[PDB]
Amino acid sequence: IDPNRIVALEWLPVELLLALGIVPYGVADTINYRLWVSEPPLPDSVIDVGLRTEPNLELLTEMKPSFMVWSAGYGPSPEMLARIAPGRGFNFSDGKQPLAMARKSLTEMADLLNLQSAAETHLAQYEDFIRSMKPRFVKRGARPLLLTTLIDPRHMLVFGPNSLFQEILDEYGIPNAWQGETNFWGSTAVSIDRLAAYKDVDVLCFDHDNSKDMDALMATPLWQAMPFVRAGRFQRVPAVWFYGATLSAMHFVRVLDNAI
């Protein structure tokens, strides 16, 4: 109800709020939100309420949030959270199309806050931006694309058909190189060797203040032996949140455009 006393316990609803012009009263893990999501800027005034997986329950109670928002099936139990203050959990996807859900979640949030018009204006901006950038990729053919991020020297996260990015790749005619298994959120962790299978594809790897790991990884003979690496198709790019919504999707497009 009070638009200035909303606490977002997970980054997905943080993005939904910012899209509607709401300044979050409190946000979980602002530090990492700044380096994993980055693009949508969070003012310094925002109170940090702890890790998304272990929010400072004491601080939350002291704060007396007007409403709390979080991600479905992630973090603290909703039954327990509901004991602190009114709230709503948002879905990232239906297991297949995250962006379709993003548009629904944004509408949902806007209805709760009576910012229906603001939602419509943002959604128009979103669809127009996506469509306007389509010609920037008419040059490339059917060469598939592999989207990844380094978890640790021994494991790479890869994003599949049900990831946030797929809908955009489909609109731009870019095949997704990963057609293997994925988790609900569209990703899966694989050993570095599993990446050697991809002989001629473009590979983007989202940085997240992990130059030390990328160095160790890129120093192994295996990495140097990677066909797409030797072919000069590997590229490190700025961080883009892969479990976000429309803002993350637009940020992806900007990063995508700059890369290919």
PDB file of C-alpha atoms in Angstrom:
ATOM      1  CA  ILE A   1       0.000   0.000   0.000  1.00  0.00           C
ATOM      2  CA  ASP A   2       2.661   2.592   0.982  1.00  0.00           C
ATOM      3  CA  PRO A   3       4.823   2.724  -2.196  1.00  0.00           C
ATOM      4  CA  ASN A   4       7.822   4.029  -0.270  1.00  0.00           C
ATOM      5  CA  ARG A   5       7.941   1.247   2.328  1.00  0.00           C
ATOM      6  CA  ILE A   6       8.349  -1.813   0.093  1.00  0.00           C
ATOM      7  CA  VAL A   7      11.187  -4.280   0.810  1.00  0.00           C
ATOM      8  CA  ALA A   8      12.359  -6.587  -2.014  1.00  0.00           C
ATOM      9  CA  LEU A   9      13.906  -9.808  -0.690  1.00  0.00           C
ATOM     10  CA  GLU A  10      15.046 -11.062  -4.097  1.00  0.00           C
ATOM     11  CA  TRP A  11      16.353  -9.310  -7.207  1.00  0.00           C
ATOM     12  CA  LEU A  12      13.512 -10.270  -9.584  1.00  0.00           C
ATOM     13  CA  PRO A  13      10.903  -8.054  -7.854  1.00  0.00           C
ATOM     14  CA  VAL A  14      13.564  -5.360  -7.380  1.00  0.00           C
ATOM     15  CA  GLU A  15      13.579  -5.011 -11.151  1.00  0.00           C
ATOM     16  CA  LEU A  16       9.778  -5.022 -11.345  1.00  0.00           C
ATOM     17  CA  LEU A  17       9.648  -2.174  -8.807  1.00  0.00           C
ATOM     18  CA  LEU A  18      12.306  -0.070 -10.537  1.00  0.00           C
ATOM     19  CA  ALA A  19      10.553  -0.548 -13.865  1.00  0.00           C
ATOM     20  CA  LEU A  20       7.478   1.095 -12.333  1.00  0.00           C
ATOM     21  CA  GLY A  21       9.482   3.970 -10.845  1.00  0.00           C
ATOM     22  CA  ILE A  22       9.303   2.732  -7.248  1.00  0.00           C
ATOM     23  CA  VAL A  23      12.310   3.302  -4.987  1.00  0.00           C
ATOM     24  CA  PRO A  24      12.688   0.195  -2.798  1.00  0.00           C
ATOM     25  CA  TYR A  25      12.693   0.879   0.957  1.00  0.00           C
ATOM     26  CA  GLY A  26      14.994  -2.098   1.449  1.00  0.00           C
ATOM     27  CA  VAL A  27      16.764  -4.652  -0.762  1.00  0.00           C
ATOM     28  CA  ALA A  28      18.468  -7.962   0.037  1.00  0.00           C
ATOM     29  CA  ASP A  29      22.164  -8.160  -0.890  1.00  0.00           C
ATOM     30  CA  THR A  30      22.628  -4.728  -2.506  1.00  0.00           C
ATOM     31  CA  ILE A  31      26.354  -5.412  -2.828  1.00  0.00           C
ATOM     32  CA  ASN A  32      25.946  -8.329  -5.203  1.00  0.00           C
ATOM     33  CA  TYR A  33      22.909  -6.782  -6.868  1.00  0.00           C
ATOM     34  CA  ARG A  34      25.293  -4.046  -7.969  1.00  0.00           C
ATOM     35  CA  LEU A  35      27.739  -6.481  -9.563  1.00  0.00           C
ATOM     36  CA  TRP A  36      25.410  -9.222 -10.868  1.00  0.00           C
ATOM     37  CA  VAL A  37      22.475  -7.076 -12.032  1.00  0.00           C
ATOM     38  CA  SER A  38      24.237  -3.707 -12.106  1.00  0.00           C
ATOM     39  CA  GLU A  39      22.310  -1.982 -14.917  1.00  0.00           C
ATOM     40  CA  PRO A  40      19.164  -1.072 -12.970  1.00  0.00           C
ATOM     41  CA  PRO A  41      20.859   1.364 -10.513  1.00  0.00           C
ATOM     42  CA  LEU A  42      19.955   1.281  -6.818  1.00  0.00           C
ATOM     43  CA  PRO A  43      20.253   4.566  -4.912  1.00  0.00           C
ATOM     44  CA  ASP A  44      22.617   4.589  -1.918  1.00  0.00           C
ATOM     45  CA  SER A  45      19.680   5.382   0.355  1.00  0.00           C
ATOM     46  CA  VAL A  46      18.416   1.815  -0.024  1.00  0.00           C
ATOM     47  CA  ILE A  47      18.719  -0.210   3.162  1.00  0.00           C
ATOM     48  CA  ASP A  48      20.449  -3.579   2.768  1.00  0.00           C
ATOM     49  CA  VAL A  49      18.488  -6.330   4.507  1.00  0.00           C
ATOM     50  CA  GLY A  50      20.991  -9.165   4.253  1.00  0.00           C
ATOM     51  CA  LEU A  51      21.390 -12.122   1.898  1.00  0.00           C
ATOM     52  CA  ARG A  52      18.402 -13.193  -0.193  1.00  0.00           C
ATOM     53  CA  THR A  53      18.881 -16.678   1.245  1.00  0.00           C
ATOM     54  CA  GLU A  54      19.116 -15.491   4.849  1.00  0.00           C
ATOM     55  CA  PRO A  55      17.582 -12.020   5.249  1.00  0.00           C
ATOM     56  CA  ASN A  56      18.067 -10.200   8.548  1.00  0.00           C
ATOM     57  CA  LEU A  57      14.712 -11.100  10.112  1.00  0.00           C
ATOM     58  CA  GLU A  58      15.419  -8.802  13.053  1.00  0.00           C
ATOM     59  CA  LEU A  59      16.043  -5.781  10.835  1.00  0.00           C
ATOM     60  CA  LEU A  60      12.914  -6.534   8.787  1.00  0.00           C
ATOM     61  CA  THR A  61      10.759  -6.549  11.916  1.00  0.00           C
ATOM     62  CA  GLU A  62      12.333  -3.298  13.117  1.00  0.00           C
ATOM     63  CA  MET A  63      11.709  -1.738   9.689  1.00  0.00           C
ATOM     64  CA  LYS A  64       7.964  -2.438   9.640  1.00  0.00           C
ATOM     65  CA  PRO A  65       7.754  -2.924   5.850  1.00  0.00           C
ATOM     66  CA  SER A  66       4.452  -1.927   4.304  1.00  0.00           C
ATOM     67  CA  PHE A  67       4.732  -4.824   1.874  1.00  0.00           C
ATOM     68  CA  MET A  68       7.425  -7.362   0.955  1.00  0.00           C
ATOM     69  CA  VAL A  69       8.167  -8.959  -2.423  1.00  0.00           C
ATOM     70  CA  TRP A  70      10.232 -12.039  -3.249  1.00  0.00           C
ATOM     71  CA  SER A  71      10.774 -14.882  -5.737  1.00  0.00           C
ATOM     72  CA  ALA A  72       8.541 -17.974  -5.712  1.00  0.00           C
ATOM     73  CA  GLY A  73      10.191 -21.081  -4.282  1.00  0.00           C
ATOM     74  CA  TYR A  74      13.356 -19.127  -3.404  1.00  0.00           C
ATOM     75  CA  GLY A  75      14.581 -17.952   0.003  1.00  0.00           C
ATOM     76  CA  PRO A  76      12.580 -17.886   3.287  1.00  0.00           C
ATOM     77  CA  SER A  77       9.284 -19.759   3.565  1.00  0.00           C
ATOM     78  CA  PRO A  78       6.327 -17.568   2.497  1.00  0.00           C
ATOM     79  CA  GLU A  79       4.375 -18.714   5.544  1.00  0.00           C
ATOM     80  CA  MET A  80       7.095 -17.324   7.804  1.00  0.00           C
ATOM     81  CA  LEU A  81       7.574 -14.143   5.771  1.00  0.00           C
ATOM     82  CA  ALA A  82       3.851 -13.429   5.855  1.00  0.00           C
ATOM     83  CA  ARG A  83       4.258 -13.287   9.628  1.00  0.00           C
ATOM     84  CA  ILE A  84       6.497 -10.219   9.324  1.00  0.00           C
ATOM     85  CA  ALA A  85       4.382  -8.168   6.932  1.00  0.00           C
ATOM     86  CA  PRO A  86       1.965  -8.396   3.991  1.00  0.00           C
ATOM     87  CA  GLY A  87       3.658  -9.636   0.832  1.00  0.00           C
ATOM     88  CA  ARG A  88       3.670 -11.433  -2.504  1.00  0.00           C
ATOM     89  CA  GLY A  89       6.016 -13.905  -4.177  1.00  0.00           C
ATOM     90  CA  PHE A  90       6.608 -13.541  -7.904  1.00  0.00           C
ATOM     91  CA  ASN A  91       7.218 -16.258 -10.477  1.00  0.00           C
ATOM     92  CA  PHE A  92      10.249 -16.087 -12.725  1.00  0.00           C
ATOM     93  CA  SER A  93       8.724 -18.453 -15.269  1.00  0.00           C
ATOM     94  CA  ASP A  94       6.206 -21.212 -15.987  1.00  0.00           C
ATOM     95  CA  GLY A  95       9.191 -23.459 -16.643  1.00  0.00           C
ATOM     96  CA  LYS A  96       9.319 -22.608 -20.339  1.00  0.00           C
ATOM     97  CA  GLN A  97       8.929 -18.879 -21.051  1.00  0.00           C
ATOM     98  CA  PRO A  98      10.439 -16.473 -18.496  1.00  0.00           C
ATOM     99  CA  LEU A  99       9.794 -13.301 -20.500  1.00  0.00           C
ATOM    100  CA  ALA A 100       6.122 -14.104 -20.926  1.00  0.00           C
ATOM    101  CA  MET A 101       5.969 -14.407 -17.152  1.00  0.00           C
ATOM    102  CA  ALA A 102       7.945 -11.175 -16.716  1.00  0.00           C
ATOM    103  CA  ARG A 103       5.264  -9.231 -18.583  1.00  0.00           C
ATOM    104  CA  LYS A 104       2.587 -10.833 -16.403  1.00  0.00           C
ATOM    105  CA  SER A 105       4.529 -10.210 -13.189  1.00  0.00           C
ATOM    106  CA  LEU A 106       5.027  -6.533 -14.088  1.00  0.00           C
ATOM    107  CA  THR A 107       1.293  -6.146 -14.754  1.00  0.00           C
ATOM    108  CA  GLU A 108       0.558  -7.918 -11.464  1.00  0.00           C
ATOM    109  CA  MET A 109       2.873  -5.653  -9.461  1.00  0.00           C
ATOM    110  CA  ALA A 110       1.432  -2.581 -11.154  1.00  0.00           C
ATOM    111  CA  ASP A 111      -2.126  -3.643 -10.295  1.00  0.00           C
ATOM    112  CA  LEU A 112      -1.151  -4.072  -6.636  1.00  0.00           C
ATOM    113  CA  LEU A 113       0.275  -0.548  -6.592  1.00  0.00           C
ATOM    114  CA  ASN A 114      -2.266   1.066  -8.925  1.00  0.00           C
ATOM    115  CA  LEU A 115       0.457   2.009 -11.407  1.00  0.00           C
ATOM    116  CA  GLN A 116      -1.401   0.397 -14.315  1.00  0.00           C
ATOM    117  CA  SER A 117      -0.525   3.200 -16.742  1.00  0.00           C
ATOM    118  CA  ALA A 118       3.142   3.216 -15.776  1.00  0.00           C
ATOM    119  CA  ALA A 119       3.284  -0.524 -16.520  1.00  0.00           C
ATOM    120  CA  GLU A 120       1.738  -0.037 -19.948  1.00  0.00           C
ATOM    121  CA  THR A 121       4.259   2.685 -20.806  1.00  0.00           C
ATOM    122  CA  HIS A 122       7.214   0.524 -19.765  1.00  0.00           C
ATOM    123  CA  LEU A 123       5.888  -2.526 -21.592  1.00  0.00           C
ATOM    124  CA  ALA A 124       5.487  -0.438 -24.766  1.00  0.00           C
ATOM    125  CA  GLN A 125       9.067   0.773 -24.361  1.00  0.00           C
ATOM    126  CA  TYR A 126      10.179  -2.822 -23.912  1.00  0.00           C
ATOM    127  CA  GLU A 127       8.485  -4.244 -27.008  1.00  0.00           C
ATOM    128  CA  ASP A 128       9.529  -1.306 -29.166  1.00  0.00           C
ATOM    129  CA  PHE A 129      13.169  -1.515 -28.074  1.00  0.00           C
ATOM    130  CA  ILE A 130      13.363  -5.257 -28.718  1.00  0.00           C
ATOM    131  CA  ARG A 131      11.854  -4.894 -32.190  1.00  0.00           C
ATOM    132  CA  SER A 132      13.963  -1.841 -33.093  1.00  0.00           C
ATOM    133  CA  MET A 133      17.196  -3.815 -32.555  1.00  0.00           C
ATOM    134  CA  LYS A 134      16.240  -6.773 -34.755  1.00  0.00           C
ATOM    135  CA  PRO A 135      18.066  -5.362 -37.816  1.00  0.00           C
ATOM    136  CA  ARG A 136      21.354  -5.264 -35.860  1.00  0.00           C
ATOM    137  CA  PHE A 137      21.488  -9.045 -36.205  1.00  0.00           C
ATOM    138  CA  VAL A 138      20.345  -9.567 -39.780  1.00  0.00           C
ATOM    139  CA  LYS A 139      24.007  -9.841 -40.802  1.00  0.00           C
ATOM    140  CA  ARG A 140      24.776 -13.095 -39.007  1.00  0.00           C
ATOM    141  CA  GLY A 141      23.287 -16.309 -40.316  1.00  0.00           C
ATOM    142  CA  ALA A 142      22.309 -19.416 -38.380  1.00  0.00           C
ATOM    143  CA  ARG A 143      25.556 -19.679 -36.428  1.00  0.00           C
ATOM    144  CA  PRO A 144      24.427 -20.770 -32.954  1.00  0.00           C
ATOM    145  CA  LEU A 145      25.261 -18.874 -29.781  1.00  0.00           C
ATOM    146  CA  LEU A 146      26.388 -20.215 -26.427  1.00  0.00           C
ATOM    147  CA  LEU A 147      25.583 -18.097 -23.349  1.00  0.00           C
ATOM    148  CA  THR A 148      27.618 -18.786 -20.203  1.00  0.00           C
ATOM    149  CA  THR A 149      29.134 -17.531 -16.969  1.00  0.00           C
ATOM    150  CA  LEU A 150      31.979 -18.983 -14.918  1.00  0.00           C
ATOM    151  CA  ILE A 151      30.934 -20.296 -11.504  1.00  0.00           C
ATOM    152  CA  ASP A 152      34.400 -21.505 -10.529  1.00  0.00           C
ATOM    153  CA  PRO A 153      37.464 -22.750 -12.467  1.00  0.00           C
ATOM    154  CA  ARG A 154      35.837 -26.204 -12.743  1.00  0.00           C
ATOM    155  CA  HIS A 155      32.244 -25.283 -13.629  1.00  0.00           C
ATOM    156  CA  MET A 156      30.443 -23.164 -16.211  1.00  0.00           C
ATOM    157  CA  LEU A 157      26.800 -22.170 -16.088  1.00  0.00           C
ATOM    158  CA  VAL A 158      25.084 -22.463 -19.471  1.00  0.00           C
ATOM    159  CA  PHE A 159      21.648 -21.088 -20.432  1.00  0.00           C
ATOM    160  CA  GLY A 160      19.204 -23.212 -22.391  1.00  0.00           C
ATOM    161  CA  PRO A 161      15.860 -23.017 -24.270  1.00  0.00           C
ATOM    162  CA  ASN A 162      13.838 -22.091 -21.196  1.00  0.00           C
ATOM    163  CA  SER A 163      16.247 -19.376 -20.038  1.00  0.00           C
ATOM    164  CA  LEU A 164      15.383 -15.679 -19.922  1.00  0.00           C
ATOM    165  CA  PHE A 165      17.332 -15.027 -23.140  1.00  0.00           C
ATOM    166  CA  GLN A 166      15.687 -17.565 -25.471  1.00  0.00           C
ATOM    167  CA  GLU A 167      12.671 -15.459 -26.441  1.00  0.00           C
ATOM    168  CA  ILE A 168      15.006 -12.702 -27.577  1.00  0.00           C
ATOM    169  CA  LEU A 169      17.218 -15.119 -29.513  1.00  0.00           C
ATOM    170  CA  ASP A 170      14.098 -16.488 -31.207  1.00  0.00           C
ATOM    171  CA  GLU A 171      13.001 -13.013 -32.283  1.00  0.00           C
ATOM    172  CA  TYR A 172      16.472 -12.283 -33.672  1.00  0.00           C
ATOM    173  CA  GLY A 173      16.852 -15.612 -35.470  1.00  0.00           C
ATOM    174  CA  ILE A 174      19.836 -16.713 -33.379  1.00  0.00           C
ATOM    175  CA  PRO A 175      19.860 -20.451 -32.578  1.00  0.00           C
ATOM    176  CA  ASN A 176      20.778 -21.408 -29.015  1.00  0.00           C
ATOM    177  CA  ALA A 177      23.721 -23.811 -29.007  1.00  0.00           C
ATOM    178  CA  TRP A 178      22.649 -25.444 -25.742  1.00  0.00           C
ATOM    179  CA  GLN A 179      19.762 -27.854 -26.209  1.00  0.00           C
ATOM    180  CA  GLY A 180      20.626 -30.096 -23.284  1.00  0.00           C
ATOM    181  CA  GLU A 181      19.027 -30.344 -19.863  1.00  0.00           C
ATOM    182  CA  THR A 182      18.278 -27.264 -17.757  1.00  0.00           C
ATOM    183  CA  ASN A 183      16.848 -26.465 -14.359  1.00  0.00           C
ATOM    184  CA  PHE A 184      13.560 -24.604 -13.869  1.00  0.00           C
ATOM    185  CA  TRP A 185      15.282 -21.249 -14.328  1.00  0.00           C
ATOM    186  CA  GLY A 186      16.858 -22.220 -17.655  1.00  0.00           C
ATOM    187  CA  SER A 187      20.438 -23.020 -16.648  1.00  0.00           C
ATOM    188  CA  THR A 188      22.750 -25.930 -15.853  1.00  0.00           C
ATOM    189  CA  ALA A 189      26.324 -26.308 -14.600  1.00  0.00           C
ATOM    190  CA  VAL A 190      28.779 -28.213 -16.758  1.00  0.00           C
ATOM    191  CA  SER A 191      32.420 -29.239 -16.535  1.00  0.00           C
ATOM    192  CA  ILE A 192      34.734 -27.295 -18.848  1.00  0.00           C
ATOM    193  CA  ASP A 193      35.341 -30.328 -21.056  1.00  0.00           C
ATOM    194  CA  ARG A 194      31.664 -30.452 -22.007  1.00  0.00           C
ATOM    195  CA  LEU A 195      32.219 -27.125 -23.764  1.00  0.00           C
ATOM    196  CA  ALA A 196      34.828 -28.571 -26.127  1.00  0.00           C
ATOM    197  CA  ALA A 197      32.017 -30.254 -28.041  1.00  0.00           C
ATOM    198  CA  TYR A 198      31.063 -26.911 -29.582  1.00  0.00           C
ATOM    199  CA  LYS A 199      33.356 -26.518 -32.552  1.00  0.00           C
ATOM    200  CA  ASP A 200      32.013 -23.451 -34.360  1.00  0.00           C
ATOM    201  CA  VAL A 201      29.699 -21.284 -32.288  1.00  0.00           C
ATOM    202  CA  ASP A 202      29.950 -17.835 -30.731  1.00  0.00           C
ATOM    203  CA  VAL A 203      30.403 -17.935 -26.968  1.00  0.00           C
ATOM    204  CA  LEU A 204      29.637 -15.066 -24.606  1.00  0.00           C
ATOM    205  CA  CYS A 205      30.635 -15.264 -20.943  1.00  0.00           C
ATOM    206  CA  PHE A 206      29.068 -12.795 -18.480  1.00  0.00           C
ATOM    207  CA  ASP A 207      31.723 -11.319 -16.185  1.00  0.00           C
ATOM    208  CA  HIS A 208      30.853 -10.712 -12.529  1.00  0.00           C
ATOM    209  CA  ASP A 209      33.965  -9.267 -10.886  1.00  0.00           C
ATOM    210  CA  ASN A 210      35.719 -12.629 -11.229  1.00  0.00           C
ATOM    211  CA  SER A 211      38.864 -11.838 -13.236  1.00  0.00           C
ATOM    212  CA  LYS A 212      40.903 -14.066 -10.921  1.00  0.00           C
ATOM    213  CA  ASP A 213      38.858 -17.140 -11.830  1.00  0.00           C
ATOM    214  CA  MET A 214      38.721 -16.291 -15.525  1.00  0.00           C
ATOM    215  CA  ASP A 215      42.516 -16.074 -15.429  1.00  0.00           C
ATOM    216  CA  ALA A 216      42.954 -19.488 -13.830  1.00  0.00           C
ATOM    217  CA  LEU A 217      40.446 -20.937 -16.276  1.00  0.00           C
ATOM    218  CA  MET A 218      41.997 -19.299 -19.331  1.00  0.00           C
ATOM    219  CA  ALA A 219      45.428 -20.552 -18.261  1.00  0.00           C
ATOM    220  CA  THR A 220      44.560 -24.257 -18.377  1.00  0.00           C
ATOM    221  CA  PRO A 221      45.666 -26.077 -21.512  1.00  0.00           C
ATOM    222  CA  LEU A 222      42.074 -27.299 -21.908  1.00  0.00           C
ATOM    223  CA  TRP A 223      40.712 -23.783 -22.307  1.00  0.00           C
ATOM    224  CA  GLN A 224      43.412 -22.810 -24.769  1.00  0.00           C
ATOM    225  CA  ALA A 225      42.588 -25.999 -26.655  1.00  0.00           C
ATOM    226  CA  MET A 226      38.904 -25.073 -26.899  1.00  0.00           C
ATOM    227  CA  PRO A 227      37.873 -24.985 -30.582  1.00  0.00           C
ATOM    228  CA  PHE A 228      35.682 -21.892 -30.286  1.00  0.00           C
ATOM    229  CA  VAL A 229      38.525 -20.204 -28.375  1.00  0.00           C
ATOM    230  CA  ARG A 230      41.116 -21.057 -31.024  1.00  0.00           C
ATOM    231  CA  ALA A 231      38.586 -19.970 -33.652  1.00  0.00           C
ATOM    232  CA  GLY A 232      38.441 -16.574 -31.940  1.00  0.00           C
ATOM    233  CA  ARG A 233      34.739 -16.841 -31.081  1.00  0.00           C
ATOM    234  CA  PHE A 234      35.018 -16.411 -27.310  1.00  0.00           C
ATOM    235  CA  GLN A 235      34.041 -13.115 -25.690  1.00  0.00           C
ATOM    236  CA  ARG A 236      33.821 -11.895 -22.102  1.00  0.00           C
ATOM    237  CA  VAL A 237      30.971  -9.389 -21.659  1.00  0.00           C
ATOM    238  CA  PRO A 238      29.538  -7.274 -18.814  1.00  0.00           C
ATOM    239  CA  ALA A 239      27.287  -8.893 -16.214  1.00  0.00           C
ATOM    240  CA  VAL A 240      23.601  -9.324 -17.078  1.00  0.00           C
ATOM    241  CA  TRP A 241      21.195 -10.849 -14.555  1.00  0.00           C
ATOM    242  CA  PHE A 242      19.836 -14.077 -16.047  1.00  0.00           C
ATOM    243  CA  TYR A 243      16.986 -14.554 -13.574  1.00  0.00           C
ATOM    244  CA  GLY A 244      15.512 -11.069 -13.968  1.00  0.00           C
ATOM    245  CA  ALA A 245      12.717  -9.545 -16.032  1.00  0.00           C
ATOM    246  CA  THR A 246      12.207  -6.927 -18.778  1.00  0.00           C
ATOM    247  CA  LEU A 247      15.009  -4.603 -17.660  1.00  0.00           C
ATOM    248  CA  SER A 248      17.484  -7.485 -17.597  1.00  0.00           C
ATOM    249  CA  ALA A 249      16.232  -8.501 -21.011  1.00  0.00           C
ATOM    250  CA  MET A 250      16.836  -5.017 -22.427  1.00  0.00           C
ATOM    251  CA  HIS A 251      20.272  -4.940 -20.804  1.00  0.00           C
ATOM    252  CA  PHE A 252      20.962  -8.306 -22.465  1.00  0.00           C
ATOM    253  CA  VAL A 253      20.084  -6.806 -25.864  1.00  0.00           C
ATOM    254  CA  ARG A 254      22.480  -3.883 -25.361  1.00  0.00           C
ATOM    255  CA  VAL A 255      25.290  -6.260 -24.342  1.00  0.00           C
ATOM    256  CA  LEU A 256      24.377  -8.626 -27.194  1.00  0.00           C
ATOM    257  CA  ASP A 257      24.471  -5.834 -29.750  1.00  0.00           C
ATOM    258  CA  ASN A 258      27.869  -4.647 -28.550  1.00  0.00           C
ATOM    259  CA  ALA A 259      29.267  -8.191 -28.737  1.00  0.00           C
ATOM    260  CA  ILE A 260      27.842  -9.450 -32.034  1.00  0.00           C
TER     261      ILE A 260
END
